[PDB]
């Protein structure tokens, strides 16, 4: 069969690295048409939903161990913030065919046997009976579960214990003084006010709740608009209807309330924020049905249970949330210490997320833009409730580890009190017994309660060829999925062991693979051998060791915890960009670039190195977190003019600021076009602030420093360049 072939290369001959490789699809899943019931491109799981580190699975343990390559799965149930965008086929007749023994679901790889009266399970080979329903003008072959690897069903009654719940929201807002002064409360109230119709309400059932919190927990009874304020204070930190109300039936009233809140605490002098007590109030408030507790704060918890200092209450809280189906999202925005390391656990183990906004301050008009945009997209994002996800492997395959934000203790089941849309997950697969078939399989199942009062089951079935050729295993290795694997292992090693240990782990992943490819595979002088499909692996890991998450040196605790929290939950596509940035050379930008094709055409990305930064050029750096517009110090007045209006480069805007609208400048338009395009994604909430930097007072040095550190291919501080990294590796895998 056409098993992917090995394409040997010399890493030393590919410097600078051919980074366009980062946008290439993984190695093909070689599956002959006969193994699929209805052959098509939809017959095998798409890389967008699931990516195995190995698309040519080792036929046995000893081979897996020898390859030194990891076996994991980058799983991503949803692709967009809104379920109306590109949904998979949806089954509705209620017929769910499953194997009696392993419980796997009917899929494109089962084999129909005995005149097609029965079916042999591809996961455990058990013989199962074909329900007479299957053939009730269409045949069984017209069914989505037989036609598609990725599809969905309307779950029957026995997959539910209680009627699907309504989308419930409880906003826990910090109204203490730090929040008033920074403008966080205002910005938050405003954004909600501006987005009440962005919040999903597909079944018109969505319920909301508002908790203002300082030293006491402030409640609000909201009447039905149809019967036309009540603020109930509770300072007793030791201690439902009309508190959690219909977003529709109380639309005007909820609006009326949000509008007064800013006035109510307009002159609050209290600096206490009882997160602990408040978190408990919200729990009791929505625990009878479960839902989302979205915390907005710019004040370190300092009163009541759970207070922190410059805690395990939270971890136990998450344990409790898993019982009542509650998820906690956090938006931490302040110039002061927030202990992201500790609070991020709330979201992490409840399937939610924590968003950290360093130095947030209403005084900077641009701080507001970032927070509101992201907070708005976050509340407008669709999600599931009471969801559980598990992966079933074919005989010989076992799911041993699970990474990502969710709740998992001692089972193969991952619980999501709510399943967001913007995160990714990873499962480690161990091969115990030897695989006997020429193929093995993995099937992800997600039992969920959609935010439209419906119970569904989303299935993702992936088929991989087995092989006993070490060459073939490497030839089909997914460099990016593998990069992701080690990224998660690194975060764990970091968020649990040592930061240095994580660095050590990262580097070893490269050393072992390089040493293995060298000894296990067989004219020249001194190349650093590897195959084309793994050609970006050395770069990514090396680049990862320079990321704010693993950097040697000094990084503020919150900025580090945050970076670590992000790398662990980012969708593959953005994880890679967060590790290795897209850099654009604008001054010599092709004419198509900056203009439509309403999607803007982007210039081709250049290597992330200051080597290519001409002192007279214009460059745009995108690292998934921010955007840096770098203009050379010796840029021609024409260029300086075409972009900002003046000709004095020293008269250019500096720092976190937007690019001015320069009339009659078509170039100025194309620049603003590229920046706006880089800002729209229908899959993440991220709004990247723009930083303008001038090259060749102390603020200007700081910006150059920051922008410059994004170019991960360069020697940065105490880390060698990529060029040297490779040389270091070559010296190590030598005798």
């Amino acid at each position: 069969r056409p098993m992917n072939q090995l394409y040997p290369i010399d890493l030393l001959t590919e410097l600078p690295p051919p980074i366009t490789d980062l946008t290439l699809p993984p190695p093909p899943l070689v599956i002959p048409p006969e193994r699929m019931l209805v052959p098509s491109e939809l017959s095998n799981a798409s890389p967008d939903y699931i990516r195995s580190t190995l698309n040519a699975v080792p036929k046995n343990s000893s081979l897996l161990k020898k390859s030194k390559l990891p076996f994991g799965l980058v799983i991503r149930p949803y692709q967009h913030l809104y379920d109306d965008i590109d949904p998979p086929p949806l089954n509705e007749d209620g017929l769910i065919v499953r194997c009696r023994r392993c419980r796997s679901y009917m899929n494109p790889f089962v084999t129909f046997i005995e005149q097609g009266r029965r079916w042999r399970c591809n996961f455990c080979r058990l013989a199962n009976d074909v329900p007479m329903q299957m053939d009730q003008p269409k045949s069984r072959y017209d069914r989505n579960e037989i036609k598609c690897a990725v599809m969905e069903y309307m779950a029957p009654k026995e997959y539910t214990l209680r009627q699907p719940p309504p989308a419930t929201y409880c906003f826990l807002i910090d109204v203490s003084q730090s929040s008033i002064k920074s403008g966080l409360l205002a910005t938050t109230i405003n954004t909600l006010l501006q987005n009440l119709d962005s919040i999903p309400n597909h079944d018109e059932r969505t319920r909301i709740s508002i908790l203002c919190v300082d030293n006491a927990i402030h409640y609000f009874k909201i009447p039905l608009d149809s019967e036309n304020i009540n603020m109930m204070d509770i300072a007793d930190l030791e201690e439902p209807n009309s508190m959690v109300v219909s977003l529709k039936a109380c639309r005007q009233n909820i609006e009326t309330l949000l509008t007064k809140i800013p006035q109510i605490f307009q002159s609050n002098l209290i600096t206490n924020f009882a997160l602990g007590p408040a978190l408990k109030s919200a729990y009791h408030l929505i625990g009878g049905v479960g839902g989302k507790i979205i915390v907005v704060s710019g004040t370190l918890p300092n009163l009541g249970i759970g207070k922190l200092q410059r805690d395990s209450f939270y971890k136990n809280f998450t344990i409790d949330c898993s019982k009542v189906q509650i998820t906690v999202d956090l938006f931490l925005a302040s110039e002061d210490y927030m202990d992201v390391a500790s609070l991020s656990n709330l979201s992490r183990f409840t399937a939610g997320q924590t968003h950290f906004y360093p130095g947030f301050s209403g005084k900077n008009p641009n701080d507001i833009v970032k927070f509101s945009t992201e907070f708005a997209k976050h509340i407008s994002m669709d999600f599931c409730m009471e969801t559980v996800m598990r992966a079933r492997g074919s005989t010989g395959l076992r799911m041993s580890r699970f990474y990502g934000h969710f709740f998992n203790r001692s089972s193969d089941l991952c619980a999501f009190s709510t399943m967001p849309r913007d995160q990714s997950y990873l499962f480690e697969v161990n091969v115990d017994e030897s695989i006997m078939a020429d193929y093995c399989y993995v099937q992800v199942a997600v039992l969920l309660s959609l935010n439209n009062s419906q119970r569904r089951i989303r299935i993702i079935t992936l088929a991989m060829p087995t092989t006993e050729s070490l060459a073939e295993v490497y030839a089909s290795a997914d460099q990016l999925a593998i990069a992701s694997f080690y990224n998660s292992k690194a975060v764990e090693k970091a968020l649990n062991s040592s930061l240095d240990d994580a660095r050590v782990l990262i580097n070893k992943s490269v050393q072992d693979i390089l040493a293995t490819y060298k000894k296990e595979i067989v004219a020249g002088g001194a190349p650093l051998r590897l195959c084309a499909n793994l050609r970006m692996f050395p770069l990514l890991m090396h680049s990862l060791t320079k990321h704010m998450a693993f950097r040697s040196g000094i990084v503020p605790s919150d900025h580090r915890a945050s970076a670590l929290n992000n790398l662990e939950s980012l969708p593959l596509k953005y994880l890679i960009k967060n590790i290795y940035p897209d850099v654009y050379s604008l001054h010599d930008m092709a004419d198509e670039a900056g203009l439509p094709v309403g999607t803007i055409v982007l210039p081709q990305p250049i290597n992330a190195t200051s080597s290519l930064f001409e002192r007279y050029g214009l460059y745009l750096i995108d690292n998934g977190n921010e955007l840096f517009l770098w203009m050379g110090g010796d840029a021609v007045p024409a260029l300086v003019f075409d972009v900002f209006g003046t000709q004095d480069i020293f008269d250019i805007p500096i720092g976190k600021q937007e690019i001015p609208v320069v009339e009659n400048s078509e170039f100025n338009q194309r620049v603003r076009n590229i920046i706006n395009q880089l800002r729209n994604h229908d899959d993440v909430i991220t709004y990247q602030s723009l930083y303008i930097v001038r090259g060749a007072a102390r603020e200007v040095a700081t910006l150059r420093l920051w922008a410059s550190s994004t170019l991960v291919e360069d020697k940065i501080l105490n880390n060698e360049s990529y060029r040297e990294f490779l040389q270091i590796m070559k010296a190590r895998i030598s005798k």
Partner: peptide, 9 residues
């Protein structure tokens, strides 16, 4: 505890 709605066992 080792028993869930998705397994259907």
């Amino acid at each position: 505890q080792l028993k869930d709605l998705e397994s259907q066992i």
